[PDB]
Amino acid sequence: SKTIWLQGFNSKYVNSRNGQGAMWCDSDTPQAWELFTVIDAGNGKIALRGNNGLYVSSENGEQAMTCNRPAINGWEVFDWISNSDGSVSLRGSNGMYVSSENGEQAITCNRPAIDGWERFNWAAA
Ligand SMILES: OC[C@H]1O[C@@H](O)[C@H](O)[C@@H](O)[C@@H]1O
Ligand SMILES: OC[C@H]1O[C@@H](O)[C@H](O)[C@@H](O)[C@@H]1O
Ligand SMILES: OC[C@H]1O[C@@H](O)[C@H](O)[C@@H](O)[C@@H]1O
């Protein structure tokens, strides 16, 4: 039921970009576009509903990640990985990890391992 924000390796916050184009980890402070409702999608999987009421997609790693899907299936469910330092990682349905890409390009879900860029600090809004 909880609304959260996600802070990437570069200290900026994950931004839905209002469903226009790709998501970026580029905002200074968490505001409306940086808030995501965590959705229990069944069997330990989660989805994320953005400010626009649409759902985050891995895009199967074929393009940068987006927040424009009107319904959850799948590319829209993720494993919520709880890391030892209290950070979170997200694993898409293709087995790859959501990456802030250090804010140098739009967010992706095509990297097979958790490194610095794939670990997010988070908090309930
Ligand atoms: O306040 C709503 C949104 O406005 C946009 O102009 C900013 O880029 C977002 O970071 C913010 O969440
Ligand atoms: O379409 C596949 C997906 O559909 C969703 O409605 C389920 O909750 C997911 O766990 C499933 O992988
Ligand atoms: O059905 C698997 C996936 O197919 C894609 O074409 C859709 O854009 C995704 O939203 C969906 O989860």
Residue numbers in the entry: 887 to 1011
Paper text:
Carbohydrate-binding modules (CBMs) are non-catalytic proteins found appended to carbohydrate-active enzymes. Soil and marine bacteria secrete such enzymes to scavenge nutrition, and they often use CBMs to improve reaction rates and retention of released sugars. Here we present a structural and functional analysis of the recently established CBM family 92. All proteins analysed bind preferentially to β−1,6-glucans.
Soaking experiments of the CpCBM92B protein crystals with glucose, gentiobiose (G2: Glc-β-1,6-Glc), and sophorose (S2: Glc-β−1,2-Glc) revealed a binding cleft within each subdomain comprising a Trp-Glu binding motif, again implying three polysaccharide binding sites per protein. In each ligand complex, the glucosyl unit stacks with the conserved Trp with the O3 and O4 of the sugar positioned by hydrogen bonding with the Oε1 and Oε2 of the conserved Glu. In the binding site of CpCBM92B subdomain β, the protein is observed to further interact with the glucosyl unit through the guanidine group of Arg955 with the O2 of the sugar, and through the carbonyl of a succinimide formed in place of Asp959 with the sugar O6. Indeed, only 45 protein entries containing this chemical group are currently reported in the PDB45. In our investigation it was found only in the β-subdomain of CpCBM92B and it may be an artefact of protein production or crystallisation. Collectively, the binding modes observed with the ligand complexes reveal the possibility for extensions from both the O1 and O6, presumably enabling binding along a β−1,6-glucan chain such as in pustulan, and additionally binding to β-1,6-linked glucosyl substitutions in, for example, scleroglucan or laminarin. The crystal structures with glucose-based ligands provide evidence for chain-end binding to the non-reducing end of a ligand, with space for potential extension at O2 and O6, which would additionally permit mid-chain binding to glycans with those linkages. According to the crystal structures, mid-chain binding to e.g. β−1,3-glucan or β-1,4-glucan would not be possible.
